Symmetry: C2
Subunit: 365 residues, 2 copies
């Protein structure tokens, strides 16, 4: 038992058997409204198909809302439908001034004459051609969204988009607004084609997400891939990135910068399995690190780190869910409900059930 | 024609990255002109050779105007269907301000889904037909509720890509009858091979929440009737203006003298053109606009008397002749002022993209 931690209850946030609902992020606005964004796409069983993967031309970015973390609006509102294909993993950032950024990335679906004419290299998965990143922005509390704004293509990235552009950077993971108002974003880039390898790189925005500048490599290895990453700034000003890996037995890793993101020291294993990671600063400046656990028993876990995020090896693991059906679940994202309660949202499935948004409400005193 | 003059042509929305087509347009009581259209990628953005009329990412979008000449440059989204691409947005504004936006859709299935489809289904361009759905706005087009799925009607043989009996649909204008009934002439596939469609009248007495089958409108052993605009005359005749297949692009008409309970035999109107749109002008004359997918390619119209009986003798107004390919047309008109009408349509010139355009007519 973990001092000061208790699960209040689990909740279902959005569930509809006709839909694959996945990859949530969530913010709470100054007016009290909790806004949770997620990817919604057809559950392909509605077309008589055998199963659903993570590409679909009609995957849209949608949201549901709550005043308390427990009662949710039943009909999702549309954040964004990309004119050129399906959209992924909406990642919300709310700035102190109320601006909301919603990062995403896309997949295009081409016909045979298009496939033949693609500039190489490109990335093909599930019959779809990768489009890379795009970001929507709202200055009215999410009532309307402007954009898309395309992140820069960064030098390590080798791919072209399905439309022949150099691939805009992208990721799944939390951005972080630094104390000086600069926005930190750790993005992924494909830096080798065969075998596929990705590395992480820090982008920085000094204009509240209108444009991004490359700052420094975050995690690079000759064999191990680094992809989904959440970034965090500690009270003393360290920049920390929590990293999903490929080729390292699902080991969750960390990389740190002590010079404001100009250089990162060597990446380290944190000592546990899980992905992807999300970090939330709690009211006492400790850090809730939540992650998916795609091993038996399938579910969602977390641990609470000290303020500087140095004690990940000794912080006890909080087990939130063990009842998952298949590995198609996870991607938790936490939000502070009030001084003593946190909602850890995630997407989930139980045996025989659809991919839906769910959450665990925690009491952290 | 006498007293009619083309004031000028306008570009309503054009972007080389997009195929923009199939417009419909209303003007709200506060004067704002709202034009809805289908927007899909021009497939050349993907290095493909051409663009057809199915795409999973075709969305219903709108641009707005106060005068019909200058238009908002960035389309707002009306609807993206969660299950596929959407077609031909057809707007009806009720006298009380409610707006209906009819549409229909295409789904894109994987091979194992294709193998398991319930037959008959309708396949075109690699996509499987979803049939109709209708969006509804009670706040002037700020938000849209739905979709509401029209009934499947007995003549229709197809199942949707999701295995349901196919909901009715069409491209064409609905019409609000003088008693508040909504008239809608829909299409149904009533023979699989060779394909044939027929038209049928649906009526709604609850402002578009539900629909009742009323009567067959146009059926033939061989000729198809598909896209149809419906219209109620001041005397109360119900008139439907019909696009055909199997009849040399002859524009046709069918009429009911009993409020839509029975239609008399369909007739040729004596000219080629499709699809048709009818607009009651301020003097109760009727502006019938249509695309002309023959040389010279473009947009044409005729002004009928109030009861729409003089189509054989009403002179043809030629609005455009500079079309590039046959992928153009589908005009829809809206009254700007007492003697100015905007005829919107989509269009292309040789080497140019599919874009929304219009011609402003002065009719005295």
């Amino acid at each position: 038992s973990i001092p000061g931690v208790r699960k209040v209850e689990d909740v279902v946030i959005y569930r509809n058997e006709k839909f694959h609902a996945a990859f949530p992020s969530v913010i709470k606005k100054k007016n009290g409204e909790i806004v949770l964004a997620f990817r919604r796409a057809p559950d392909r069983k509605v077309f008589g198909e055998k199963g659903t993967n993570h590409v679909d031309p009609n995957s849209y970015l949608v949201s549901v809302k709550s005043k308390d973390g427990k009662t949710w609006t039943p009909e999702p509102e549309l954040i964004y439908s990309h004119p050129f294909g399906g959209s992924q993993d909406p990642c919300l950032l709310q700035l102190k001034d109320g601006t909301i950024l919603c990062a995403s990335y896309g997949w295009a679906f081409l016909r045979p004459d298009g496939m033949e004419n693609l500039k190489k290299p490109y990335f093909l998965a599930g019959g779809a051609v990768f489009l890379g990143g795009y970001v929507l922005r709202s200055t009215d509390g999410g009532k309307s969204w402007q954009g898309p704004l395309y992140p820069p293509h960064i030098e390590p990235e080798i791919n072209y988009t399905a439309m022949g552009e150099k691939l805009p950077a992208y990721n799944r993971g939390a951005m972080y607004e630094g104390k000086n108002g600069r926005i930190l974003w750790v993005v992924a880039a494909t830096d080798r084609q065969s075998p596929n390898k990705t590395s992480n790189h820090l982008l920085i925005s000094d204009d509240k997400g209108l444009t991004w500048k490359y700052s420094a490599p975050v995690a690079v290895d000759e064999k191990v891939s680094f992809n989904e990453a959440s970034v965090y700034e500690t009270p003393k000003g360290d920049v920390v990135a929590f990293l999903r890996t490929a080729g390292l037995g699902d080991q969750a890793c960390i990389a740190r910068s002590v010079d404001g993101g100009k250089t990162f020291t060597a990446w380290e294993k944190m000592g546990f399995q899980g992905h992807p990671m999300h970090a939330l600063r709690l009211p006492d400046n400790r850090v809730l690190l939540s992650y998916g656990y795609r091993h038996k028993p399938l579910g969602i876990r977390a641990r609470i780190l000290n303020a500087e995020c140095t004690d990940f090896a000794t912080a006890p693991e909080i087990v939130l869910r063990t009842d998952g059906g298949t590995t198609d679940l996870g991607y938790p994202w936490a939000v502070q409900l009030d001084k003593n309660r946190v909602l850890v949202s995630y997407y989930f499935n139980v045996p025989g059930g659809p991919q839906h948004i769910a959450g665990s409400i925690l009491e952290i005193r």
